[PDB]
Symmetry: C2
């Protein structure tokens, strides 16, 4: 005897799977009882979550709108078409000059599909070096020649770096490398870079060497949509992105590509649209995840609202005011400030490693992450932490609140130094000072009470399980 | 001024995005007002949907449980660990002999990660030919040498076929090809094959030529869990799968791999675990989709229930009873029946193509899909349709109901023939008979009223928008 549909199929999660339900409730509390400073994290809207968890997951729709393998896609077609047109509107793109594919499962699938579309296996790519703030999907191999990124397994990558004294991209050494190496593709955009990108100069380098130019704007796509940073669309052939992070949508990916006449120097047009779509499907993916596309469409309408432009503005102002607070304390930021959503904090002048500060923050439910500074590829443990504003800004925090966050980080570094001074620099010694540290418990209590003063998108704090 | 969190972040979808909400409601009606016979389609549970649309989408967790890039993962870790142990339990696997990775975004990402883990670029692969019922991710190039599947772009594939007269896999030609070609990897499992697989024979062939053996059980994983078909685990090195289709979970993928000592063939052990994990991350993916992993963990507990075993039994019985009904009418099935969830209906003896039947069915809200028969790679339009039982079985339909489904299919083919007889064999002529066809409108009405008689998992038909 099969279970009645009502028993297995309509019964709520809280009854069907109390273990999983309970774990989700604990994670919901964790999300609103600490301070989330991971620069790639955000808290998305209830509207997005409702579309994400919907009957849209029940439909196979391999293909493209109006050209599907299977029938019964009349409404899936409308959702994806609306998602795609909203994607162009959100980034102020003319439909005759730009197209977009909204099926990539996530950011890294979007990049690998873009590469597959325009490159052959073993074609050359350059991207921002990982210890300079680049992303894995832009290429990564170890000093021993071990190929880590799929980008470096299936293509030939070479990284470019920041200037090791200023922290800004070294545009002169970028050009020299591109002229020696002759990449078929140059990637710009990154994960841990605190300044804007000079896309115009990347276009000059790509033109001089003969490269395609792609921007991976995952970290700053929300700022791009709000026209709060430079638009990569003015200069790049292809723009990839996640749809979470600062865009505040579901976890998905997008590939934008140029269409129509190629700009003056015969009468040729861009040729990306078909190759891009074909790389995504049939070459690489199966059925699109239509609940993600529906949820993404929701996020993209929200990203076009005046409220979202005000959010991106506030994200930028919060990161600035946090940085200025830290510098007012005598701390060092790479490049001495920020132009986007994050700061990169250089801890080496204090004699600390990023790990020690990350660990102690984590014990206080402040989530940051350790990060290399000035492109240092040394085996030396990374010398900094990366701190982002999107997540707390989404909970409604403004400058005064981010100045308080800086106070908590100040106290965190102070406690880290007191421990290092009492127990010693070596990691084994440092950990001894974390065992039953009262002062850590007071800061942890302090940040929880601060954390609980603010609202939460995505679920109602008032009907949580754990308060 | 930013929007208050309550406005942008807590407001329901129905208010935030009426367009998208309305489209989801129409898709919900479509899903319960027709007959869904796409063999890769299912209807998942509300419990899975509640986990899928949850605050789990807000957390970055690159890495593995207990070895993450970022802090704050204590509950994500417990969810993934429980998902993994539930995955092993669902398929009756000893944890000392088998491990699993549950981060693949979907079926195709799971396969490509498995290949990346155990193969170098351009290594040789064989898989079931697409017109013989294989899947794209197993290798596909065209007659002109055009590499379509990423599997054929980054690796060197060669397909094996069914016997063109019996419809069963040609195990003799498989062995001969494998000995000539010397693949590093042989794939078994497929998308439109109506019989069980002799994994024992694939193991003999793989041992004879020195190949790894992988089973892709996407289509039948639910039947595998319920022990209603042969287990690939007894003979294969690696098993990949989707988590939707007959498993009835969210859209995701899994990679199972052997652990522990190898069978005599030195005290050596299997070496897959670390390579597989590393291929998924950091090589290919970014952050896992924790809402999928949570929903997947729910689905896997559900797949271990006695009700789910009875479901898989019923899926098989319904497909059998449907096939016997069609053959009772003089129709031909490839291999003359089924041993799993689908039948493959050979229409060429009626002088018809799969397209014509698919299109007319689609106009009656019966969703099937056209499919090549007997591995015919000819350019002639495919001569069959593929029909699956999972989706209707999940709405509670039993043998009597699937005999009624065959009646609707009988009437559908009967009208397809009347139209061809009146208007003509060429495609252009056939379409003329679809214009305002009363008899089609009657079958469509008959299908909707039959469809309405059954329940629906995943949402409450009571509170639908469109009734």
């Amino acid at each position: 005897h099969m279970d009645p549909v009502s028993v297995w199929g309509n019964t709520p999660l809280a009854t069907v799977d109390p273990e999983i339900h309970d774990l989700i409730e604990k994670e919901k509390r964790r999300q609103c009882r600490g301070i989330e400073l991971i620069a790639s994290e955000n808290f998305t809207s209830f509207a997005v979550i409702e579309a994400l968890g919907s009957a849209l997951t029940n439909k196979y729709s391999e293909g493209m709108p109006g050209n599907r393998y299977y029938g019964g896609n009349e409404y899936i077609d409308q959702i994806e078409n609306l998602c795609r047109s909203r994607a162009l509107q959100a980034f102020h793109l003319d439909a005759q000059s730009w197209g977009v594919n909204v099926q990539p499962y996530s950011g890294s699938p979007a990049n690998f599909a873009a590469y597959t579309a325009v490159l052959n296996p073993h074609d050359r790519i350059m991207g921002l070096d990982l210890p300079s703030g680049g992303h894995l999907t832009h290429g990564y191999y170890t000093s021993g020649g071990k190929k880590i990124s799929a980008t470096s397994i299936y293509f030939e990558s070479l990284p470019y770096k920041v200037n090791s004294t200023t922290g800004y991209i070294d545009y002169d050494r970028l050009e020299e490398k591109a002229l020696d190496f002759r990449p078929k593709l140059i990637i710009c955009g990154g994960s841990a870079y605190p300044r804007d990108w000079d896309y115009k100069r990347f276009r000059e380098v790509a033109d001089k060497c003969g490269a395609l130019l792609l921007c991976d704007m995952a970290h700053t796509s929300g700022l791009v949509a709000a026209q709060e940073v430079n638009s990569p669309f003015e200069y790049c052939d292809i723009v990839t992105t996640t749809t979470h992070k600062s865009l505040r949508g579901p976890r998905a990916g997008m590939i934008f590509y140029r269409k129509g006449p190629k700009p003056p120097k015969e009468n040729a047009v861009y040729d990306f649209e078909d190759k891009i779509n074909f790389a995504v499907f049939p070459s690489l993916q199966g059925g699109p995840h239509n609940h993600q596309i529906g949820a993404l469409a929701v996020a993209l309408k929200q990203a076009a609202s005046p409220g979202f432009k005000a959010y991106a503005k506030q994200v930028k102002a919060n990161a600035v005011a946090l940085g200025k607070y830290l510098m007012g304390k005598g701390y060092s930021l790479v490049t001495g400030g920020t132009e986007n959503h994050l700061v990169l904090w250089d801890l080496r002048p204090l004699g600390l490693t990023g790990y020690k500060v990350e660990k102690l923050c984590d014990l206080c439910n402040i989530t940051v992450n350790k990060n290399a500074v000035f492109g240092d590829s040394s085996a030396l443990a990374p010398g900094g932490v990366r701190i982002g504003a999107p997540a707390m800004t989404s909970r409604g925090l403004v400058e005064k609140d981010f100045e308080q966050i800086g106070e908590f980080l100040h106290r965190a570094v102070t406690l880290t130094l007191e421990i290092q001074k009492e127990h010693g620099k070596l990691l084994k010694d440092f950990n001894k000072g974390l065992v039953n540290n009262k002062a850590i418990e007071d800061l942890k209590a302090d940040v929880e009470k601060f954390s609980a003063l603010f609202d939460m998108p995505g679920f109602l704090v008032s009907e949580m399980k754990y308060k």
